Amino acid sequence: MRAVNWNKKEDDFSLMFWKQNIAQFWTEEEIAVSSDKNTWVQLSKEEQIAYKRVLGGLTLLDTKQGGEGMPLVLVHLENLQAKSVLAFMGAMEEVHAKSYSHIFTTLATEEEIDDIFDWVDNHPLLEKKAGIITSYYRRLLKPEVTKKELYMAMVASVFLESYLFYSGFFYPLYLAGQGKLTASGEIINLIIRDESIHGVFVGILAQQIFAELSAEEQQEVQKETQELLMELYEIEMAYTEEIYTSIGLVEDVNRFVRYNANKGLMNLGLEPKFEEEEINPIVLNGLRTD
């Protein structure tokens, strides 16, 4: 049985991601939110509800990715250095989830927070969305898994990392880019650079597996990947309608979802599927805090 030996590299990129996770972890433990109360009380009821709800959605996706997607992906990799990178990425999804709790606590009473968690738990569209992605992970709960199964879990995982989070990421960036709730925005910004490197690393792992599939196996997972992408898109358009119509931002969000979907595909080595458009400039300004 093999022990991880860092003195003989198993690939060319694992060590850099190892280091990089640790350096981002470190920047995340410096300052936090409270100053936000001033702008939080200036938002309408509908805005505060959208925010709480998206953050609820983010926390659900972080929970599933730390508690399921990273562990089940890593438990089958034969490359022990990459497996260590993932264990650490997996833990970082838990740190992010805990950050969302911290933001919640500085913005709502324990009773409101609790209602938001009840809501996320019982919300059919989030169940469905989380349910589709995690069905790729659950398929790995067995002693031996095919390359195809494992490739599809990695595609699912990058669609989560680089694409599904962005329908909720939109709002805090959009507000912060207007100088509202910018301390919470700074936390999200940090979380977003973790998630971007997670989606790059898993997408490298994916492309290695894909290179070992037969031509027939490649055509099959390419089909499933395009299906999964658009099945998710269609769920996202519906989710976007539920959360944002009250505040008039539905087509802004939808366009940001396309923009990120195309980044996720590119993490996988794939061509973009949505028409290419500039990033929302107010969101860009939110990314440009500190």
Partner: protein, 117 residues
């Protein structure tokens, strides 16, 4: 003009392929004798990849400008590798683009290279 580049996960490589310009992946032995433009990617906290820093120690005399691939998710560190090389060798930032670039970025890059020559 000649384009020297570095790519770790393929994005920069995919962009140079849309270019129709002669272009070469840098390595440690490489010397470039003509004017060239560098395309780099960007590594953590807006930095220049080590291979690029080495290649410029030996090849900056002919460097006429620099583009960066990055990801706007990095905020004010988006593409910052171009800023650091631009400052360090007093050459123009040709452009910054995300990932493998959009057709606008490609067209933009070419126009900037004429303009710069």
């Amino acid at each position: 003009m000649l384009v020297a580049y570095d790519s770790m996960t393929g994005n920069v490589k995919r962009f140079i392929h849309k270019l129709n310009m002669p272009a070469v992946q840098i390595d440690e032995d490489l010397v470039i004798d003509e004017d060239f433009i560098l395309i780099t990617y960007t590594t953590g906290f807006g930095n220049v990849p080590e291979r690029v820093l080495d290649f410029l120690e030996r090849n900056n005399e002919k460097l006429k400008g620099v583009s960066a691939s990055g990801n706007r998710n990095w905020g004010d560190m988006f593409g910052a590798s171009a800023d650091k090389i631009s400052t360090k060798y007093e050459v123009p930032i040709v452009s910054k683009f995300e990932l493998s670039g959009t057709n606008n970025d490609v067209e933009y890059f070419k126009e900037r290279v004429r303009e710069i020559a």
